[PDB]
RNA sequence: GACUCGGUGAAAUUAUAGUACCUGUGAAGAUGCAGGUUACCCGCGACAGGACGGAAAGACCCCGUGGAGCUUUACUGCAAC
RNA sequence: GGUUCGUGGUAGGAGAGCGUUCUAAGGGCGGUGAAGUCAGACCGGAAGGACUGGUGGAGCGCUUAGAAGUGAGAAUGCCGGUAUGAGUAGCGAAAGAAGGGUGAGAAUCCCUUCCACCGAAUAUCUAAGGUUUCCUGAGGAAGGCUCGUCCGCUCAGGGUU
RNA sequence: GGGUAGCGGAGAAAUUCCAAUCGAACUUGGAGAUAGCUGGUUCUCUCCGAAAUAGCUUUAGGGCUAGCCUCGAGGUAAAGA
RNA sequence: GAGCUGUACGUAAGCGUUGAUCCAGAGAUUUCCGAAUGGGGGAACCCACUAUCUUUAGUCGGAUAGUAUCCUUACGUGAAUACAUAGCGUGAGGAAGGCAGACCCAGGGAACUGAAACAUCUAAGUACCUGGAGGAAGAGAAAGAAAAAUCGAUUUCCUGAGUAGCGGCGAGCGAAACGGAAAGAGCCCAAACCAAGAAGCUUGCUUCUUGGGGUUGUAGGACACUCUAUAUGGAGUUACAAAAGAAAGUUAUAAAUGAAGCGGUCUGGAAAGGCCCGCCAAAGACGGUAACAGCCCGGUAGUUGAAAUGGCUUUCCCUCCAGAGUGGAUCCUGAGUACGGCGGAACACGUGAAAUUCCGUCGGAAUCCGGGAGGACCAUCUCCCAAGGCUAAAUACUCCCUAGUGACCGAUAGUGAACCAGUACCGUGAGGGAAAGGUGAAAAGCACCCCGGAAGGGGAGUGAAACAGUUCCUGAAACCGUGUGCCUACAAGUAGUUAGAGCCCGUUAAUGGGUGAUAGCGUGCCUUUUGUAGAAUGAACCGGCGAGUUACGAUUUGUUGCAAGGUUAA
């Protein structure tokens, strides 16, 4: 996938377009990604589970990977990603 | 079928035989020979080149139907008595190849 | 057992039905057509005259140039001898 | 465009059409709501076609041609659903009773006592056959012709030397 | 526990039994057998509109040709009524 | 190249840039049953023997290997019986079974059905059984086709032609050659004869093995002489002899790189949509992404890539190899064969006037001065040389693999099977054989409160929507209910229709809608019938599904093109 955990992505579709966050997890089998403070859902958690008080938990929900674009630290903008080989291993490059 | 009444074809007798050596000639009636130019030699090979007879079954036979205007030297495998007379009456020379 | 109450709960059948009687009429035997005669609306327990009631495309009878099993000095065959 | 004579109809002949799915090409509609679906007092000579509103939530008309799995009320048709009969028949040989208990709930589960039935069996083994139905703890949706706290049922663990 | 198997077995003999099938088991295939028989065959309007007869037929509730219907086209001492 | 420990709704414990999971090539491991093969057996089990090793104080245990049958072939033993054979033993090789329900060749071979009955005939050499196989098989280099005077192996297609014929001359069956195409390729023996053994002893003659030689028609060969070759050249594992290798290239089996919009604004839950601007394009394939995307993602065009294995093509290696001329003394050129009789079959050809080919049976040639065929047969002429074998391609089919396509289906369709289906279930068994798809973009899968034992509700919350609430898109009809505007307890009803008060409404605005006191008229629908309301048939109701089609011929009408011409087939 064009993004991976640790990457600073911009969200380009959905209720949260314009908002940028950090990729907390990637689900490449589902082709979805979890962005910090993006796509908050209210989970109605019964008390039994981890959380012995329970309650309405406001947590992030996965977004589709094609809805985020990688940030280039230099420009500070969303960019498409190309791959160039330094010599040992290939690395992602902004365009 | 006629619902059991003996069909027509079984009421009436078979007739004749087929000849193993039956000849069938390509027929060329005088009228088409007018197509050719005067004082022309008209052969089978010329009649098929022109496309007057495409297949030359057993040979080419000239028949009298119509009349002829041009003087022609016409060679064919057969002529009707009337054909020969009519070609000659115009002033031609019939040859039998 | 039936019947009443509580529990549970099928089936065959079924064109739609607000589904009387008499005499007649009609594919010649009508709840349904005509003319009359009777008849307030809804049930429950009973009885079977009718719905040519249900059930089974009648086994009788005939028909089909339909089967099948059987017979023989029917025809043509075959084994066996 | 008139005139004249016609226009009942089964088998059946002839003609013109409606509508359905798909294709092509043009041209459109549709999240400001497609198809489908529901309703209506609208339009055409018929098959049929619109419009408006509800539901629906993403596809679909129209024009001209083309191609067909192209139109259902009957086949004791096939499949599915649902009626009717009807709260009707039935609930499958048999003796139960009360007290106590359990439980949300008890004719129906547990205990006690009395009563009743089999006893050359309705008792005890055991082969076949079945294959976990056995034991214990939970359970009460379905199954059990009623009920059910119970069970040869459901779920867990166990158990055969 | 075994044996006999369908053009076959078995029968103290009834056409009796061979897995709730037996005048010839069951199953798959040939197979969409064949059915001059019965049933069924789906939208609309317009024009016309029969026959239930003759002849022959192992034919009689089938068929064929003719008669009667329909569509198209022809031709004229118009021959039709 | 960053996550991973499969579904599928988990809990736990862990792994991973010192590169996991994952993808491809190659290895290793591979219980038991099954041909099943050490013996047995009711498949997936039981019970051994012989070596060698191991364990124990020794039984008792453990490990590894071998041990079926038949055929062929070495070798050894070895009876009646003296030699010997059979038999027996050991060692090598080989087979066995399965299947693509296809295609191919062979052995065996129905019936229904058609003939409007039926027996010849048809169906049909089909179905089916059995055997053999191969990637194809079969066929095949003329004892051929012909008689335009010539052709030149076979196979397949077009045509000939529904012709010639066959046929209770019925129903039906039905060629072939010529012509046009696809594809093409030719070869090796047997025999004369030569050499070398081997034997029989016919004792120098004969038949047996190996090698050479040699392959054909107015003939060829052997055999005589003669010219050149003895690897100069040529040819090969697809026939033509047979087994080996290498190397290079290329294809397949993983991948890599890959242009251009987060453009503005509108509606919206969300924009890929609308409107307005740009841009890339050897890339506007397809799919995904919160509605319809060339420019968001996977990609796509283009351009790169393979450690390993397999295929293919070349080249090299390796291997193998005599071919022209001239005579005609003699010799050779496929024998229980050809052919014939009898009985069958195959030939389109049903015994016919019946050639041609095969089977059983019996009889049985010629053998170069020879033999066969030209549809009885003879003569002439012409063409051919049987009784031995091999042979690619053009053709058939698809259980499979890869990439695609569709005026093909879209959940009663399409496979029986979109879903754990040949399952469940039925049957002793062979065998028969279902039903059953859709929450949402995302689980955000309803915390919490309330009634209730629970189920199930009502709130609250999530969501665009919950009348999307774990079978959850839409949600028709039958059928079941609640509510009520009009009518109904003196009426006799195929249930409507025409007239019509009264009451209640208010429309796609129409000489409107609902209901219906009362009055007139009025025997369902379908099928089948001379005739049915029918006391004749069929339908409980609703829904879905459910019947003149296609191919190839014939004929006729219409249309179009060309017209004494028209038209191509493969
Ligand atoms: Mg009761
Ligand atoms: Mg009467
Ligand atoms: Mg009356
Ligand atoms: Mg009646
Ligand atoms: Mg009756
Ligand atoms: Mg009857
Ligand atoms: Mg009967
Ligand atoms: Mg009319
Ligand atoms: Mg009239
Ligand atoms: Mg018609
Ligand atoms: Mg549609
Ligand atoms: Mg609907
Ligand atoms: Mg249809
Ligand atoms: Mg129906
Ligand atoms: Mg009753
Ligand atoms: Mg009663
Ligand atoms: Mg009772
Ligand atoms: Mg009882
Ligand atoms: Mg006793
Ligand atoms: Mg128990
Ligand atoms: Mg109960
Ligand atoms: Mg219990
Ligand atoms: Mg019986
Ligand atoms: Mg058949
Ligand atoms: Mg009329
Ligand atoms: Mg007769
Ligand atoms: Mg690695
Ligand atoms: Mg064994
Ligand atoms: Mg018949
Ligand atoms: Mg890109
Ligand atoms: Mg907005
Ligand atoms: Mg949507
Ligand atoms: Mg979409
Ligand atoms: Mg013979
Ligand atoms: Mg024959
Ligand atoms: Mg001869
Ligand atoms: Mg013979
Ligand atoms: Mg001969
Ligand atoms: Mg001859
Ligand atoms: Mg002949
Ligand atoms: Mg010869
Ligand atoms: Mg299906
Ligand atoms: Mg559906
Ligand atoms: Mg549900
Ligand atoms: Mg009254
Ligand atoms: Mg009165
Ligand atoms: Mg009925
Ligand atoms: Mg036609």
Curated annotation (Swiss-Prot), chain B:
The protein, known as: Large ribosomal subunit protein uL15
Keyword Ribonucleoprotein: yes
Cellular component, GO annotation: cytosolic large ribosomal subunit
Keyword presence, Signal: no
Family: Belongs to the universal ribosomal protein uL15 family.
A Gene Ontology BP annotation from the UniProt entry: translation
GO molecular function: rRNA binding; structural constituent of ribosome
Assigned keywords, A-Z: Ribonucleoprotein, Ribosomal protein, RNA-binding, rRNA-binding
Assembly information from the UniProt record: Part of the 50S ribosomal subunit.
Function: Binds to the 23S rRNA.
Organism superkingdom: Bacteria
């Amino acid at each position: 996938m064009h993004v991976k955990k640790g990457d600073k992505v911009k969200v380009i579709t959905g209720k949260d377009k314009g908002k940028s966050g950090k990729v907390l997890a990637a689900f490449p089998k589902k082709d979805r990604v979890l962005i910090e403070g993006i796509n908050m859902v209210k989970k109605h958690t019964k008390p039994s589970n981890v959380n012995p008080q329970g309650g309405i938990l406001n947590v992030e929900a996965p977004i589709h990977v094609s809805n985020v674009m990688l940030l280039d630290p230099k420009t500070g903008e969303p960019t498409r990603v190309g791959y160039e080989v330094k010599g040992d291993k290939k690395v992602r490059v902004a365009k | 079928f006629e619902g059991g009444q003996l069909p027509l074809f079984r009421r009436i007798p078979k007739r004749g035989f087929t000849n193993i050596n039956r000849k069938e000639f390509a027929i060329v009636n005088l009228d088409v020979l007018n197509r050719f130019e005067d004082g022309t030699e008209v052969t089978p090979e010329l009649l098929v080149e022109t496309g007057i007879i495409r297949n030359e079954k057993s040979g080419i036979k000239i028949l009298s139907n119509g009349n002829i205007e041009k003087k022609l030297t016409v060679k064919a495998n057969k002529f009707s008595a009337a054909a020969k007379e009519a070609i000659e009456a115009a002033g031609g020379k019939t040859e039998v190849i």
